[PDB]
Each structure stands twice: as C-alpha cells, then as structure tokens.
Symmetry: C11
Subunit: 68 residues, 11 copies
C-alpha cells in the first residue's frame, strides 16, 4: 500500500514514523508547491504523518490537509 501526496502550498511535510515497539519521527520530507510524493509503507515506516496544505490519495479514497 502507498500514499500519494501533492503539495498545494509551500511548507508541506511528509513525516515517517518508525515501525516496531518504538514510535518516533525518523524522517521528514519537504515538498514545495506543486511537487508530488508517492511513498510506501516499509519495514521501517508503518505510519505516516502529513502537515501543510496538500492533496492526499490512498487506496481508501482522497483526503485533504491544511496548514497552520
């Protein structure tokens, strides 16, 4: 399973959270206005956090996030 993320505005952050007993930030990808990121769930990433104004697509539909 993967998630699609389009940055509608500057400052969007695609954060990865560690898989396992411990849960913490292990990476944050900065997406500029109009950039798109397609990312999977991996051995290392069992959860993903999105901040900023962005369009999101998953196998389970579409979603929106806003800044501030």
């Amino acid at each position: 399973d993967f998630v699609v993320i389009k940055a509608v505005e500057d400052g969007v952050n695609v954060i990865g959270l560690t898989r396992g007993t411990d849960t913490r930030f292990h990476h944050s990808e900065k997406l500029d206005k109009g950039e798109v990121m397609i990312c999977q769930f991996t051995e290392h990433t069992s959860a993903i956090k999105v901040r900023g104004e962005a369009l999101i697509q998953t196998a389970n539909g579409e979603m929106k996030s806003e800044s501030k």
Copy 2:
C-alpha cells in the same frame, strides 16, 4: 490494512493498542487541526482508537469521530 485520519480540529488523539495476549496503549499521536495521519495494523498494533473530532477512512468506508 491501513487507516486514514484527518484532524478536523485540534485535540485529535490517535492511539495504538498492543498486539498479543495483553491489551494496552503503547503510543498516542496527537494531531493539530488539518494534520493527516496514515497508519497500518502491524506486528505491534492490532487495534486502534481515535479520540477527538476527526475524519476517518478505512477499506470498510468512511467514519467521523466526535470529541468531548
């Protein structure tokens, strides 16, 4: 199987429950207004609880969380 969760307002709390014989929360991710989280059921998480005002998506359809 993954769950998508949108924080409609501040105070949304995404909680993970341990897999196996015992059942406790091992993690709580708090989302601010607009932040989106996408998490899987995993080796360590077999049940998930959503607290606060949130939009929720699973393979089984959409659902809304209510705070208080």
Copy 3:
C-alpha cells in the same frame, strides 16, 4: 480483517473473546461517546462482542448496536 466501532453513547464496551479450544473474555476496551475504535481479529482474538449503543462497520456491511 477488521471491525470499525463508533460509540454513539458513553459506556460502550468492545469485548474480545479468546481463540482456541476455550472461549473467554480477555479484554474490554471502554469507548466514550464519539470515540472510534478500529480493531482486528488476531491470534488471540477470534470473536468480538459489542455491548452498548454504537455504529459498526465490517466488510459485510453496516450494523448498529443498541444499549441494553
């Protein structure tokens, strides 16, 4: 294979019965009004009982549970 449970009122319990020759209650997750709980069937949970008023989602459609 998961079940989604939104509690329509306070005092809602999501009970888990054990897998194996024996069938007994091993845990009860209390849900306050508006709280949503997504949970799986597991090596330890092979059946689930929902007591109280709530909205239920499975791959096999939707169901509602009434309080006493």
Copy 4:
C-alpha cells in the same frame, strides 16, 4: 471469513461447533437485545448455529433468525 450477529431480542444464542472428525457444540455465547457479535471460522470452529431473533451478515448476503 466471519459472521456478524445482532440480537434483536433477549435470549439469542450463538453456538460454536467443533472442527475435525467430531462435530460437537463446544461453546454457547448468549446475546441480549441490542448486543452485536462478530466471530470468525477458526481451527476449532467450522460450523456455527444461531437460535433466536437476530440479524445476520455474511459475505453471501444477509439473513434473519426467528425466536421461539
């Protein structure tokens, strides 16, 4: 797979029958009005029986069991 059972009246019984060369009632889960039970077919259970007024959801469709 799994079967969803919603007791529409008090005294709805959900019996588990043993898998294997022997066929026996190995457990009886009593359901009262409103309560909902989602249960699987397992190593130990290959056939399920339902007595009482209840709503039933499987993959093959919906079904109803009468009381008396």
Copy 5:
C-alpha cells in the same frame, strides 16, 4: 467457502458427507424453524446435503430446499 442455511419449517437436516475415498454422512445437524446454520467445507466435509424446507445462501447464489 461456507453455506448459509435457515430452516423455514421444523426438523431440517443439514447432512455432511465425508471427504475421501468413500462417501457417507459423518454427521446430521437438525435445525428448527427460524434457526440458522452456517457451515464450511472442511478436511472432513467435502459435500453437504440439505433435507427439509430451508433457505440457502452460497457464493454462487440463492436456493430453496423443500419440505415433503
């Protein structure tokens, strides 16, 4: 795969036939009016026979067994 059976009238027989070289009924399960039986194909049951007035659901459609 599983078969959903609901007895329309009393004394319905759900007959399991043996998997393997030979073919005899290893079991007969009586369902009373309004009761519902859900049973799988198993290591021991490769054929099932319904005798009496009952409603039948499988993945391949719906069918009715008749009294006399």
Copy 6:
C-alpha cells in the same frame, strides 16, 4: 470451487467421477424432490455428472438438466 444442485423431482443422481489416470464413477448420491446438495471438487473427484431433473448453480451461473 463447488456445485449446488436442487432436485426438481424424484430420482436425481449426483455422480462423482474419479480424478487421475482412470475415469469411472465412484459414488452416486440419490436426491429426492426438493433436496439440495452442495459438493466440491476434490482429490478424489475432479468431474461431476448430473442425471435427472435438477437446478444447478456454479461460479459460472445456473444450468438445468432434464430426466429420461
């Protein structure tokens, strides 16, 4: 995969043919009017023949046979 067979009148025979090098009948299941049979293909049965007036359902739809 399995076959569903309803006897439209007395004298319906569900015949199983041996899987493997040989091809002979190893069992005939006599179905009376109104009865329903649900059989799989198996390590012992790789071909099934129906004789008499019956309604049949498979994952490929429905089909009827006529007697005499």
Copy 7:
C-alpha cells in the same frame, strides 16, 4: 483450477479429455445423454477438453454452444 459446465441438448454428446504433457491424445470420452449435465475440471491428467455433439457450455470465459457432426 477452472472447470467446464456442459449440458447435452441432444443425444450422443461426447466430452473428450486430452492428456497433459508432451504427448497430446484422447484418454477418455464421457457420453452424455440428452439433458444430462457434466461439470469437469482441468487436472494433472487433462489439460485440454473436446466437446462433440449439440450442447451448452459454460466457462469462466462466458457461454458457448456446440452442434452435432
């Protein structure tokens, strides 16, 4: 392993099975009389099926008919 449904609309329908392997040849012909229905699988021994006679045929790939001769 997909199967084939066959109903004989008339008398003298043959359901032939051809051997699986490097050699291809008939190993069995099942006679179906009018109205009879046969449902057969593809097996270790049978990789090809031949239908002779007027019959109705059902596979995962749709419906088909056959005529005598």
Copy 8:
C-alpha cells in the same frame, strides 16, 4: 488460463506451441463444424495459434478468426 475455441466451419486448426528456448508446434488439433475445444496454457504450451473460421473466448474477451 485457458482458451475456448468453437469451429464455425470445417478446417479449423488449433495449434500448440512449445514453451522454452525453442518455439515450434508440438500438436495440431483438427476441429469440425460445431465442435468446441477448451485448452489451457501448460508446461509444454506457452502460446496457441488458431486457423480457420472459429469463435474464440479468453479472459481478455472474445475474438473471431477467419479461414483462408
């Protein structure tokens, strides 16, 4: 996967092609008007060719072949 081939006329040829480094026909099944042939791809058959006026069916839909 399997092919379904119906001869619309006499002179229909169902040709089997060899799996492996080499590619040549190892069998030619001759079909007369009205006859139907269903055949799989196999350890020995990784391609099939149809000659003659025939009606063909595959998972990718239908197709007619013309003789000459």
Copy 9:
C-alpha cells in the same frame, strides 16, 4: 497469474516477435500470422517482451489496441 496477449491478423504478413528475458534483449523467434489467424501467447521464462508488426487486432488485460502495416 502469468499474463498473455491475443493477436488477430487483419491482413497477411503479420509478425509476432518474441524478445528474450534477462541481461540481453533480442528476437528469439518470429511467428508469421496471415489474414484471419488468431494467436494467444504468454510471457514466459524466456519471453518477457513482445513486438508486433503488421496490421493486427490486439487484446490484453489493460485494454485493446490496433497495429498497422508498412
């Protein structure tokens, strides 16, 4: 579930070419199809790419396609 291709030759002179799987890529066989003949073939341990020349009707799980000659 090992995918396959369906190819019907609209006119004569149709070639169904098979390219090799592995480090290298070359034609290891060309099947000539003539007007009206149909060919269904799989990708395999030896065939991972297929090139079609001439005028034909093509069918795959991803839809339909036509090819022209010249």
Copy 10:
C-alpha cells in the same frame, strides 16, 4: 505487470532502466509508425522510459507520449 506501447509515428523508442542499486539504460527498442510493443517489468527492468509519439496502456489507464 506489463506495458502496451503503440507507436503513432516513426522514431519511437522504448527504453528499459536497470533494477537494483544502480540505475541506467540497458536497452532501447525502436518502434516505427504502427508497431506495438508489449513488455513486462522484470528482474533487470524496474523502470521504463517512452520517447517519441505513442499510445500507452497500463493497468492504471491510458497515456499518450509526444516527440520532439
């Protein structure tokens, strides 16, 4: 999965990129007006580049490339 590429003009090139740590072209297949190439992702090809004017069909829909 696999890709269908239909050359709409002369000078169509279908390029395969290497799978593994290193990413580089390992082949380029020319296509002339009218020709159709059908190709798989493989052990050696994990990325595919299409240059020129062509029609493209994937499991994720159609797409048209242009030349110049």
Copy 11:
C-alpha cells in the same frame, strides 16, 4: 505497484528515495516534454518524488504536478 509519469514541460524531475533506515535520493531521472516514464517501487526505491509540471497516474487515480 508502479507509477506513470508524463512530462508536460522539459526538464521534469523524477526522484527515487532509498528504501531502508535512511532516506535520501539515489537517482534523479529527467523527462523532457512529452516523454513518459513508467517505474516501480523496488528493493531500492520505497518512495518517489516528482518535481516539474507532469501528469501522474497510479492505482489510486490521477494527480498533476506543477513547477516553479
């Protein structure tokens, strides 16, 4: 799983982020206007980033990227 990317502007940038504990780009493939790149997630690429104006296709539908 694979991603389809058509460039609507010269110098489009398709970036592959490394699979594993560390997340950095191991490759940047350029696409000029009209060119199409079809690529997979691999043992080495667990996340993809698109920079520049382009059409993007995935199993989860369509998405556009904008440059600047």
